[PDB]
Amino acid sequence: AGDSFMRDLLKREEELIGYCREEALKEPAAMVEAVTATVWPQNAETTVDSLLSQGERKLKLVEPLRVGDRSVVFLVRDVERLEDFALKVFTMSRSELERLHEATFAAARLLRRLLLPSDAVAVQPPFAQLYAVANYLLLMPAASVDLELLFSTLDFVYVFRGDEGILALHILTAQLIRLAANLQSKGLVHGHFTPDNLFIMPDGRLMLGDVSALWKVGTRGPASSVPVTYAPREFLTATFTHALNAWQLGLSIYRVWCLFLPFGLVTPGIKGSWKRPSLRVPGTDSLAFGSCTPLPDFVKTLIGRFLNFDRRRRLLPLEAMETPEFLQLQNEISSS
């Protein structure tokens, strides 16, 4: 840690990340504007009740942060605690959100690597419509940036330069592997170990979001829960395995060094992206590094093992941490 280094490095990039962050709100600006007025119709401060404590909280809008699948995330200030949070709002199903709520908070209680929400709130019924915005607002720590936005930022201006920047790419690589190994240690699997769900927190720590999708390995579930471009072929109900997350780990490490996905897979927000929609579509299944930031040999090897097309042969993260390649990665980091 290492965490402190990433923390400072990120502070440096605050301004440009913010600009790329606003730019990504432009196309869905219609949804953002109308979610924003659904929650803050009149003024910048709304009183909500907690569905967990029954107490009130007063939340001032600071700015919209991000749009996802049927969701928008805002930065807000709790004006009694003088603390800032991310506030996530969902579009519309009532029963789906009830289940999401129970499962998210059950999973959170059961559990330093996963971003957990601290409250769930509703404008003064819960879960009913409040565009179709549900009356269910999820409060959690605000991240400095998610990896998907980081990659889009680097694609606009590559602010990871020279040796500090090389060190950051090494650190991200180690942190992605440690995080996936943590999951494995605990016999867990997450269908969305992907850049838009991987967060650099203000203390420089890398964390995984959406605790509700954190399952016991072997769990059977909707295959559609996996982003199609991050799904290996065996996901195209399915069994959620460590091999799914080894695959996704390989893809995210590739993007740290290369920004676009491998195999021609479509990577929105990256100018070098090709346009293969999924592995279900015919294409080049060869791993290619030609246009990446130059990678250390030991990284190209780790990526190649993670991205074995044979599921039974994929290197798992815990085992990767015992390989000479991982030891060298850590050794380089320590020394710098």
Written as one string, the DSSP assignment of 134-171 is EEEEEEEPPPSEEHHHHHHHHHHS----HHHHHHHHHH
Nearest residue to 205 (alpha-carbon basis) of 242, 178, 165: 178
Residue 78 burial (C-beta neighbours within 10 Å; 0-12, 13-18, 19+): middle
CA–CA dist 272, 295 (Å, integer): 17
Return the CATH superfamily for domain 22-142.
Phosphorylase Kinase; domain 1 (3.30.200.20)
Tokens in use for 69? 């699948």
Chain centroid to Cα 327, Å, comes to: 26
E strand or H helix that includes residue 35: helix 29-39
Which residues lie below 8 Å from residue 330, measured CB to CB, with a gap of 6+? 174
Helices (H) and strands (E) in the chain, counts: 9, 13
Which residues lie below 8 Å from residue 109, measured CB to CB, with a gap of 6+? none
3-state secondary structure of 273: coil
Query: How many CB atoms neighbour CB 272 within 10 A?
Result: 11
DSSP 8-state assignment for residue 308:
-
Q: Which residues make beta-bridge pairs with 73? A: 66, 88
- What's the first-to-final CA gap in the chain, in angstroms? 12
CA–CA dist 200, 208 (Å, integer): 9
> What sign for the dihedral angle of Cα 118, 121, 126, 131?
negative
CA–CA dist 320, 277 (Å, integer): 29
Q: Are 209 and 199 in contact (CB under 8 A)?
A: yes
Respond yes or no on whether the N-terminal peptide bond of residue 2 is cis (omega within 30° of 0): yes
74 φψ region: left (φ > 0), alpha (ψ -120 to 50), beta (else): beta
Chain breaks in the chain (C to N over 2.5 A) after: 92, 111, 124, 130, 236
- Find where tokens 């996901």 sit: 235
Indicate where the chain has its CATH 1.10.510.10 domain(s): 1-21+143-336
CA–CA dist 18, 1 (Å, integer): 25
Tokens in use for 203? 């203390």
Query: How many CB atoms neighbour CB 130 within 10 A?
Result: 20
Written as one string, the DSSP assignment of 86-150 is EEEEEE--HHHHHHHHHHHHHHHHH---B----EEEEE--TTSB---EEEEEEEEPPPSEEHHHH
Tokens in use for 90? 């969902």
Query: How many CB atoms neighbour CB 29 within 10 A?
Result: 11
Indicate where the chain has its CATH 3.30.200.20 domain(s): 22-142
CA–CA dist 121, 127 (Å, integer): 10
E strand or H helix that includes residue 59: strand 56-68
Q: Are 153 and 20 in contact (CB under 8 A)?
A: yes
Nearest residue to 13 (alpha-carbon basis) of 185, 179, 158: 158
Q: Helix 297-306 to helix 242-258 angle, to the nearest 10 degrees? A: 140
Experimental method: X-ray
E strand or H helix that includes residue 318: helix 317-320
Total residue length of the chain: 336
Nearest residue to 56 (alpha-carbon basis) of 140, 124, 134: 124
Written as one string, the DSSP assignment of 208-254 is E--GGGEEETT-EE-GGGS-GGG--GGG--EE--HHHHHHHHHHHHH
CA–CA dist 213, 192 (Å, integer): 8
Q: Helix 147-156 to helix 242-258 angle, to the nearest 10 degrees? A: 20
CA–CA dist 122, 51 (Å, integer): 7
Query: How many CB atoms neighbour CB 55 within 10 A?
Result: 10
Q: Are 28 and 35 in contact (CB under 8 A)?
A: no
Nearest residue to 73 (alpha-carbon basis) of 145, 14, 11, 7: 145
CA–CA dist 226, 323 (Å, integer): 28
What's the reported resolution, in angstroms, to a tenth? 1.9
CA–CA dist 186, 304 (Å, integer): 25
Provide CATH code, domain 1-21+143-336: 1.10.510.10
Q: Are 244 and 218 in contact (CB under 8 A)?
A: no
Amino acid at the residue 7: R
CA–CA dist 164, 175 (Å, integer): 16
**SS3 letters across 244-264:** HHHHHHHHHHHHHHHCCCCCC
Chain centroid to Cα 254, Å, comes to: 15
3-state secondary structure of 32: helix
